[PDB]
Each structure stands twice: as C-alpha cells, then as structure tokens.
Amino acid sequence: CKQADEPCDVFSLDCCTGICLGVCMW
C-alpha cells in the first residue's frame, strides 16, 4: 500500500487505509 502522503493509483491499491486522491488522504 502507501503511507499517508504517498502517490498511488486511485483505482485499486494505494494507501494502506483508503484511496489515492493524489496521495493517501488518511
């Protein structure tokens, strides 16, 4: 996944707790 403030794809996996609207917003 990605730690808060990490860039990722907002479609499947990104932040270990939610989504990716630019970067983990949590």
From Swiss-Prot:
The keyword Cytoplasm does not apply. Its main location: secreted. GO terms for cellular component: extracellular region; host cell presynaptic membrane. The keyword Nuclease does not apply. One of its GO terms (molecular function) is ion channel inhibitor activity. Keywords: Calcium channel impairing toxin, Cleavage on pair of basic residues, Disulfide bond, Ion channel impairing toxin, Knottin, Neurotoxin, Presynaptic neurotoxin, Secreted, Signal, Toxin, Voltage-gated calcium channel impairing toxin. Expressed by the venom duct. Belongs to the conotoxin O1 superfamily. Omega-conotoxins act at presynaptic membranes, they bind and block voltage-gated calcium channels (Cav). Specifically acts on L-type channels. It blocks molluscan dihydropyridine-sensitive calcium channels. This is Omega-conotoxin TxVII. The chain holds residues 52 to 77 of 77 of the full protein.
